[PDB]
Amino acid sequence: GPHMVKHPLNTAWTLWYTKPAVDKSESWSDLLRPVTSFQTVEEFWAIIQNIPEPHELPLKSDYHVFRNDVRPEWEDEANAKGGKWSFQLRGKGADIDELWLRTLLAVIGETIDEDDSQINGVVLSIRKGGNKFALWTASEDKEPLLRIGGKFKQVLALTDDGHLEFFPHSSPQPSITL
């Protein structure tokens, strides 16, 4: 059929997956790969509707969505001087699918990033102790981090009692709590 008129995103993005280990001999590098890259709203939706939703994912897996020129590794030059805003869902009662989707929309939509971009990507981690959302920033500039963190809190729909913690990648206590 015909091509839809696409709506561009401000940068390209790549979805990565960390698989859970099936054998004692698999390393991190063996378990992480980039899956697909996209730069339109429509391509994003087609990907999201054809990969497993978060509630399907196994323990010790991760989704990463990062700008196409940044690896989801803190060693990457774009990440190494920065950190992440982290949120842990103590409980399975939250709708992790919708929280993740809202986070993704906010990220690719450039709504909560600074105009001078700080956000490099976002990570969903499936973990026994509770699942985590992490929003990765290029720097530790405090004032821009506070604005991103507050907006991230609103995207995730937390009340004052729910807490975001910012962790500089160079480690493990948080330097900001919201």
Contacts to Ca ion by CB under 5 A: 53
Give whichever of 19 and 81 is closer to another protein, judged by the CB atom. 19
Q: Which stretch binds another protein (CB under 8 A): 38-46, 65-73, 137-145, 162-170?
A: 38-46
12 belongs to the binding site for another protein (CB under 8 A):
no
Could you tell me the two tokens for 75?
Answer: 């060693």
Q: Which of 95, 146, 157, 175 binds another protein (CB under 8 A)?
A: 157
1 belongs to the binding site for another protein (CB under 8 A):
yes
Give whichever of 22 and 129 is closer to another protein, judged by the CB atom. 22
CA nearest 153: which of 92, 99, 116, 110? 99
Q: Which stretch binds another protein (CB under 8 A): 1-9, 68-76, 87-95, 170-178?
A: 1-9
User: DSSP secondary-structure letter at 25?
Assistant: T
User: Which residues pair with residue 63 across a beta bridge?
Assistant: 17, 124
Whole-number minimum distance, CB 45 to another protein, in Å?
5
Give whichever of 62 and 165 is closer to another protein, judged by the CB atom. 62
Could you identify the residue written with the tokens 């378990």? 31
4 belongs to the binding site for another protein (CB under 8 A):
yes
d(C-alpha 111, C-alpha 118), whole Å: 12
Q: Which of 23, 116, 143, 161 binds another protein (CB under 8 A)?
A: 116
- Reported as type and span, the H/E element at residue 137 is strand 131-137
Q: Which does 109 bind (CB under 5 to 8 A by kind): another protein, Ca ion, none?
A: another protein
Q: What DSSP assignment string belongs to 57-110?
A: PPTT-EEEEEETT--SSTTSHHHHT-EEEEEEE-SS-S-HHHHHHHHHHHHHTT
